[PDB]
Short mmCIF file of C-alpha atoms and ligand atoms in Angstrom, two decimals:
data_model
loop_
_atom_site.label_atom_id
_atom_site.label_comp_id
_atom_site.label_asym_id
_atom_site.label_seq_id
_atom_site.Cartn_x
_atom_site.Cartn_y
_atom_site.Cartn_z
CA UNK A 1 34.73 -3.97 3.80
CA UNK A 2 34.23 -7.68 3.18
CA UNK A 3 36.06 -10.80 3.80
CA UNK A 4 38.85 -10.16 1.31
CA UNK A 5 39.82 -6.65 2.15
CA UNK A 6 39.53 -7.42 6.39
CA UNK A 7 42.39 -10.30 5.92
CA UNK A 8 44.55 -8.93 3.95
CA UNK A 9 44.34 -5.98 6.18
CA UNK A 10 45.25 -8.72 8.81
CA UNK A 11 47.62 -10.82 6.56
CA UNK A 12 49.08 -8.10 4.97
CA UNK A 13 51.38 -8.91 1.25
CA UNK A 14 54.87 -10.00 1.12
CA UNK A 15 56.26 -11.73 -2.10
CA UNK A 16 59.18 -13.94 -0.38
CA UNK A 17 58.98 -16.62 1.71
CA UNK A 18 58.98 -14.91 5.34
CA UNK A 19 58.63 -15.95 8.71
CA UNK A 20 54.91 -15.85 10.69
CA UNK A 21 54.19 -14.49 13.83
CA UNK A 22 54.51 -18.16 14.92
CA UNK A 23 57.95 -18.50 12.91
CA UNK A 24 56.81 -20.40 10.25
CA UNK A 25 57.35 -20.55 6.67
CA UNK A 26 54.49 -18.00 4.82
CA UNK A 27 53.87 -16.31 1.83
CA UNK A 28 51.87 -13.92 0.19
CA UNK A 29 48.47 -13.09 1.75
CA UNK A 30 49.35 -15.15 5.11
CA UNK A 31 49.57 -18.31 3.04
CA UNK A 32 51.27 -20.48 5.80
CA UNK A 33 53.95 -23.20 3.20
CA UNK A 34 54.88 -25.52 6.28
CA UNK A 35 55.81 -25.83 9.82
CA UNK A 36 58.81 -27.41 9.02
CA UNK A 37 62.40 -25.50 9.88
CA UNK A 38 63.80 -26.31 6.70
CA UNK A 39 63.56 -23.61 4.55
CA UNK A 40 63.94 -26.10 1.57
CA UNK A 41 61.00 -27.72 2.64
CA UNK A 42 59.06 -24.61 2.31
CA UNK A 43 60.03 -23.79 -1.20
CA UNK A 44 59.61 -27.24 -2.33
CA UNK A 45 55.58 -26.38 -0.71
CA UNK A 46 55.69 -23.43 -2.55
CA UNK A 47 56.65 -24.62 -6.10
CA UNK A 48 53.72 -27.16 -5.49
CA UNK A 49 51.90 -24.80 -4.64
CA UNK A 50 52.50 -22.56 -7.38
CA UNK A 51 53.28 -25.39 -10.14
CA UNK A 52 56.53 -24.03 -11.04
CA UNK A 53 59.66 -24.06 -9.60
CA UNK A 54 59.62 -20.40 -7.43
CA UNK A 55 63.09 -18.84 -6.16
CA UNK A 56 61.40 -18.35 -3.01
CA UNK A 57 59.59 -15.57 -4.53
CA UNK A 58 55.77 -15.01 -6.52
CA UNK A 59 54.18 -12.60 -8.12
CA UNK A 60 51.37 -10.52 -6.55
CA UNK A 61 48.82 -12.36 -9.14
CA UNK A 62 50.12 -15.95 -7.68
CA UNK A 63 49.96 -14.57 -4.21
CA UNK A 64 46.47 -13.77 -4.90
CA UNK A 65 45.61 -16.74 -6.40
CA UNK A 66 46.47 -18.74 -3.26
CA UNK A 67 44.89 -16.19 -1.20
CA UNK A 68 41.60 -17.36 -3.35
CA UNK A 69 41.96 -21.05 -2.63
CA UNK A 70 42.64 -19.87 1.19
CA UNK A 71 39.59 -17.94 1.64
CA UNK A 72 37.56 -20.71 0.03
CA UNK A 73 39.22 -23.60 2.21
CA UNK A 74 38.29 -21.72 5.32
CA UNK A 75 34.35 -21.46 4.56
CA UNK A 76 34.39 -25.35 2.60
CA UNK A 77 36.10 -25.53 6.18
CA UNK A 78 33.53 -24.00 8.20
CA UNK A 79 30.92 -25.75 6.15
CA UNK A 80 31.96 -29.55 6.83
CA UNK A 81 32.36 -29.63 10.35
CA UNK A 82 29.57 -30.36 13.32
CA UNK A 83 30.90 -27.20 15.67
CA UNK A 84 31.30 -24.43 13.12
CA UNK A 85 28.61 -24.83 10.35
CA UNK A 86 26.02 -24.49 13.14
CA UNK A 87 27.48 -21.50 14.65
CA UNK A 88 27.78 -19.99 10.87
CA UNK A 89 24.93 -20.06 9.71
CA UNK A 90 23.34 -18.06 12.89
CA UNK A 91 25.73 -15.26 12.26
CA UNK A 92 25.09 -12.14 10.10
CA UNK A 93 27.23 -11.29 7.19
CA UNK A 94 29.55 -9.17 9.64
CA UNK A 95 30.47 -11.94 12.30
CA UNK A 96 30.72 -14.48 9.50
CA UNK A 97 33.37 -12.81 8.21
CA UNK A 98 34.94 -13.19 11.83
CA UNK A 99 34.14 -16.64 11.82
CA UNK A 100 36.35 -17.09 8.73
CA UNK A 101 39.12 -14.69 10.16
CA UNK A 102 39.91 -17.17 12.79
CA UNK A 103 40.00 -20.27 10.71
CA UNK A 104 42.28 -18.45 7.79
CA UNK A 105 44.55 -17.75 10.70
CA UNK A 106 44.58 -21.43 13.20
CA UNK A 107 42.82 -23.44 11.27
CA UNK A 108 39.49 -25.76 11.49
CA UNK A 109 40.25 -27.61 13.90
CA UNK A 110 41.48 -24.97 15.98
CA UNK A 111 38.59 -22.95 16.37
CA UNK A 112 36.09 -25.97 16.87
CA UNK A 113 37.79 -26.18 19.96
CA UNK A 114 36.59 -23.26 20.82
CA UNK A 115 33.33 -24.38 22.76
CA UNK A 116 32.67 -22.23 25.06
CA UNK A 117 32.96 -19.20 22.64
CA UNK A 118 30.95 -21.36 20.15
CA UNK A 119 28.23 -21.33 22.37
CA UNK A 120 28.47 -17.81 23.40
CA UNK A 121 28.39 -16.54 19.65
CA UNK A 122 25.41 -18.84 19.17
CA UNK A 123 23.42 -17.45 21.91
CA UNK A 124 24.08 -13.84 20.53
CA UNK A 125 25.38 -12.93 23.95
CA UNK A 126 27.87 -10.57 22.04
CA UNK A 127 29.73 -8.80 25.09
CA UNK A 128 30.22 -12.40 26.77
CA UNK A 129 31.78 -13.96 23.81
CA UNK A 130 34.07 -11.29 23.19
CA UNK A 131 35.22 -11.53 26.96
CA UNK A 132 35.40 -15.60 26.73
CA UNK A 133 37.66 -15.18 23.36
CA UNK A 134 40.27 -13.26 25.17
CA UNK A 135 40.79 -15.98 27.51
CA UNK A 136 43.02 -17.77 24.83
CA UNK A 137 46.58 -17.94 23.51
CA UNK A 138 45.35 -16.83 20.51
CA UNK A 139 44.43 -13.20 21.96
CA UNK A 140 47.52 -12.73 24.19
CA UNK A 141 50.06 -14.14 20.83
CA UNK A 142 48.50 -11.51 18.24
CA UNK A 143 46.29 -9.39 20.91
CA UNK A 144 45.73 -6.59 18.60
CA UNK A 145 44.44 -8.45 15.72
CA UNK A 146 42.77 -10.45 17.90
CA UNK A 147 41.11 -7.50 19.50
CA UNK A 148 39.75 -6.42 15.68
CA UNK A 149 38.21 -9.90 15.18
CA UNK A 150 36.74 -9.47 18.78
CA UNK A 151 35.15 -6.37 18.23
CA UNK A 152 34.10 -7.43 15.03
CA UNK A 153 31.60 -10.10 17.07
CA UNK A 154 30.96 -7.67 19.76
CA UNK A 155 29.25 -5.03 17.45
CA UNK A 156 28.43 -6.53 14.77
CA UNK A 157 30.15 -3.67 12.62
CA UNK A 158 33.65 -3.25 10.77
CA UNK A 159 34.79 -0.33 13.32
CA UNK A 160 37.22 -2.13 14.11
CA UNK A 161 38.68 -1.66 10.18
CA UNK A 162 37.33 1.20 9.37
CA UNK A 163 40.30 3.89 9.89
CA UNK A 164 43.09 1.39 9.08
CL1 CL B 1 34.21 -16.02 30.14
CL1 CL B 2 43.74 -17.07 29.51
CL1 CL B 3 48.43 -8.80 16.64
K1 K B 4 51.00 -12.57 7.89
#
């Protein structure tokens, strides 16, 4: 297991536009196009994304190419802010992987808010971060991913991955 392989376990692959768990706009390996309603706004996202003009539809190489840039925006994301970096670089290779889970799926920002946790995760008090995490919208909208990511600070191991 690594980074790659545990979201798009998460993510999953769909080559048309399709709707989130948040009903927005997606492609590909969870690559969120806009929160917009207007499905014409998210194709025009995806042709600019893409740099041609899609039918709503991409190729499995183009849906891993974004996947690519995702993957890389959520450590450069990690990486330039004051909360995360910090908490990053005291993690192992297992729970930075985690780390990166939850900013691929709400963003920066998002999980910076996350102070409590943050600190939790810092102090290596495993079973109390997992228990603070739960406490959050994010666990009770997508509880059983969010349980995976969870475990996957708790222990410090991919069981949570392993037989799916
Ligand atoms: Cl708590
Ligand atoms: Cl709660
Ligand atoms: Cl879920
Ligand atoms: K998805």
């Amino acid at each position: 297991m690594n980074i790659f392989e545990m979201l798009r376990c998460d993510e999953g692959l769909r080559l048309k536009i399709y709707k989130d768990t948040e009903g927005y706009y997606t492609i590909g390996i969870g690559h969120l196009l806009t929160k917009s309603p207007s499905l014409n706004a998210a194709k025009s996202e995806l042709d600019k994304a893409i740099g041609r003009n899609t039918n709503g539809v991409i190729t499995k190489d183009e849906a891993e190419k974004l996947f690519n840039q995702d993957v890389d925006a959520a450590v450069r994301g990690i990486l330039r802010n004051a909360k995360l970096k910090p908490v990053y670089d005291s993690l192992d290779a297992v729970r930075r992987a985690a780390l990166i889970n939850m900013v691929f799926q709400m963003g920066e920002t998002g999980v910076a808010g996350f102070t409590n946790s943050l600190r939790m995760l810092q102090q290596k008090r495993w079973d109390e971060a997992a228990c603070n995490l739960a406490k959050s919208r994010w666990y009770n909208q997508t509880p059983n991913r969010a349980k995976r990511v969870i475990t996957t600070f708790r222990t410090g191991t991919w069981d949570a991955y392993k037989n799916l």
